[PDB]
Amino acid sequence: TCPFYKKIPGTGFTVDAFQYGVVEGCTAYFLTHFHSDHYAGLSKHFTFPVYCSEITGNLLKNKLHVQEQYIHPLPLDTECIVNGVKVVLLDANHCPGAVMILFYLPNGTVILHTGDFRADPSMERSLLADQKVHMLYLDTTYCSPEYTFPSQQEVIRFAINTAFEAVTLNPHALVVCGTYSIGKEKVFLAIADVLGSKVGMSQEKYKTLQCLNIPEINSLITTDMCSSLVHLLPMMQINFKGLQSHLKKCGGKYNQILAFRPTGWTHSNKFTRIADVIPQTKGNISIYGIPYSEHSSYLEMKRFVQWLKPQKIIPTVNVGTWKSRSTMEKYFREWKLEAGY
C-alpha cells in the first residue's frame, strides 16, 4: 500500500508510486526520474498514464518497454493542464531527465515536489520566483550538517588533472570509471575529452546513453573497446580483483589502471579536502573514490528552503526511523526561526 508522502491531496495524482499495484483513486502516475528505487514496478504491461520528462519517457520506452500510448512526456518550464489541474516540470539538477513538479491545486494551494534534487541558487530565478508554495515534498537525503562535499566543478577539475597527469606520464595506462545507474556522466565525459578519446562501454550502457539527448553524443561514446582508452564498467567490478581481470582482457595494450568510483558522501569527507584525496593502490592498479554528489549538501538544502519559505515540509527520504524524523524536524524549526517565516 502506497504511503501518504507519495500522494498529492486534492488530486488523482501520485509521485514515484509504481510498486503498490493499482493505487485507489489514481488517474495519473508521475515519475520524477529514471532511478530504480523510484520506477520500482513499471514494465511493458503497465496500462495507466505516466507523466514525465522527454528523457525519462525515452528510457521508459527503450529500457523498460512501456508502450508508447501510456507515455506522456511534458516540456520543461511550461504550464500544462493534466486531468484538469495545472502543473509545471522544472529541472531538478539530479540525473538526466530528472524533474521537480509544481502542482496548482483546484482550491488555491500550491505544492512543490522536489523528486531527487541538488539545490542551486539558479532555482531562485526559475518559475518558482513568481508565487507562494504552501507544501514542499523535500529530498532530505543529506539533511544533517555533517554532510559536506565540494562543488561538482571542483570534483571534475580534480578528476581531469589526475587522469591527464597519469596518462601523460605513462601512455600505456588505461582509465576505468564505474557506473550502476544514469547520472554523473560528466565524470567519464570530462576525462575522455582531456585524453582525446571516446568512452568505451557495453552495448547495454551505450543504449542507455543514447536515450539522454546529450549534444553530439555520437562523437563522445562507442562500443568498440579497442579504440578507447577510457572504459566504463559496472560499479561492482571497481575493486582490485575486477580490475586485474579486465586488464587481462585488453591483450597487452596496457600495463597500468587508474580507476574512479564516483560515490556520494563518505566519512572521509569529514577529514580530507578534495585537493588532498589519495587513492588505494595494489601493484599497477590505483582506485580513487571521488565525492561527486547529485543530491543537495546540508547547506544547499538549507539555503533553498529558507528562500522558498514553505508553510509545511514533508520529507521523502530518511522517513523510516523515529530518530531520523526527529532530527529533520528539529532542523526545519531552526531554519524557520533563523529566517523569520
What's the closest the beta carbon of residue 115 comes to Ni ion, in angstroms? 8
63: nearest Cα among 236, 188, 203, 235: 203
Considering only the stretches 35-43, 134-142, 235-243, 323-331, report the one whose residues sit in contact with Ni ion under the rule CB under 5 A.
35-43
Which of 116, 139, 185, 300 binds Ni ion (CB under 5 A)? It is 116
Question: Could you tell me where the beta strands, DSSP code E, fall in the chain?
Answer: 7-8, 13-15, 28-30, 50-52, 71-73, 80-82, 85-91, 99-104, 110-113, 135-138, 173-179, 199-200, 221-222, 230-234, 256-263, 280-282, 285-291, 312-315
Binding region for Ni ion (CB under 5 A) out of 28-36, 50-58, 249-257, 312-320? 28-36
Cα distance between residue 90 and residue 127, in whole Å: 8
- Contact between 300 and Ni ion by CB under 5 A: the answer reads no
- Examine residue 16 and tell whether it contacts Ni ion (CB under 5 A): no
d(CA 251, CA 243): 14
Residues after which the chain has a gap (C–N > 2.5 Å): none
Which CB, 6 or 35, lies closer to Ni ion? 35
> Using CB under 5 A, which of the segments 15-23, 65-73, 115-123, 228-236 binds Ni ion?
115-123
- The footprint of Ni ion on this chain (CB under 5 A) covers a number of residues equal to 2
Residue 246 near Ni ion by CB under 5 A: no
Residue 181 C-beta: closest distance to Ni ion, Å: 8
Task: Give the range of 30-38, 132-140, 216-224, 322-330 binding Ni ion by CB under 5 A.
Answer: 30-38
Does 185 engage in binding with Ni ion (CB under 5 A)?
no
Question: Residue 126 carries which DSSP code?
Answer: S
Cα–Cα dist 199/262, whole Å: 16
Nearest distance in Å: CB 33, Ni ion: 6
Residues of this chain that bind Ni ion (CB under 5 A): 35, 116
